[PDB]
Amino acid sequence: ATRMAPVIMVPGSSASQNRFDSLITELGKETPKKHSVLKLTVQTDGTIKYSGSIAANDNEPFIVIGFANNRDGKANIDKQAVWLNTAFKALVKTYHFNHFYALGHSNGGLIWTLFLERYLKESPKVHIDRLMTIASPYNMESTSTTAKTSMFKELYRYRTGLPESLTVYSIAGTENYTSDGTVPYNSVNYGKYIFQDQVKHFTEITVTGANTAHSDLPQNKQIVSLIRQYLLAETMPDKVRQKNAQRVQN
Ligand code: NA
Ligand code: NA
Structure with a gap:
């Protein structure tokens, strides 16, 4: 196992960009360690623009991968998963890492999922250890508990391609309306049909307000606290750890 393990982060549509940033x-700022930040923007023809950089001794760089076409909907998500694989392959051709963590915000969680089910096997020496998704609409804009969108049909159909040794955290709020921008709780909840019994551990966590496009301070602090505790596996103060533990729904 290599010394570098980057945390690769994929955001959603522009409504949710302020929250991501x-x-x-x-x-x-909250992580005691300096994490270097490299940003890739994949263009609509598949070429890549780059911003920032990875320090040569940084064992845990943050790499943001987003898309010139970051719009909603299955047609776009199917392309973003190809673009993600394009960027991922460019990165494994530049940097030697054989382990990574993934963060997907909003549609970013769906983009990551589809990439992991279909495309990660193309870089078979590189393994994902942990995935966190934030308010990812697994059943798109549906408020249904039984109807399956075309998007969810494709994620469910390929769920057996997921890596079995993966640990998955899915953060959701409790908002169950669509007024823009927000995703309904019933759609985020379809995540469990994809992940449970396809991966080593699946953990649902509630953060109130996490489904809304427009963030606020108190919700971002909780989310950063969880990313640190569960995605980065940082040692946290005892009362913080215990309180975050009580946000787990299963
Ligand atoms: Na830091
Ligand atoms: Na394409």
Whole structure:
């Protein structure tokens, strides 16, 4: 197992961009370690623009991968999963890491999922250890508990491609309306049909307000606290750990 293990982060559509950027800034400030930040933007023809960089001795760089076409809907998500694989392959051709962690915000969680089910096997020496998704709409904009969107049909159909040794955290709020931008709780909850019994551990966590596009301070602090505790596996103060533990729903 290599010394570098990057945390690769994939955001959602532009409505949820402010929250994403706020999360990264705050995650950098709250983590005692300096994590270097490299940003890739995949263009609509598949070429890549780069911003920032990885320090040569940083064991845990943050790599943001987003897309010029970051719009909603299955047609776009199917392309973003190909673009993610394009960027991922460019990264494994530059840097030697054989383990990584993934953060997917909003549609980013669906993009990551589809990539993991279908495309990660193309870099067979590189393994994912942990995935956290934040308010990812596994059943798109549906408020149904029984109807399956085309999006969810594709994620469920390929769920057996997921890596069996993966640990997955899915953060959801309790908001069950669509007014923009927000995803319904009933759609985020379809995550468990994809993950349970396909991966080593699946953990649902509630953060109130996490389903809304427009963030606020108190919700971002909780989210950064969880990313640190569960995605980064950082040792946390005892009362913080215990309180985050009580946010787990299963
Ligand atoms: Na830091
Ligand atoms: Na394409």
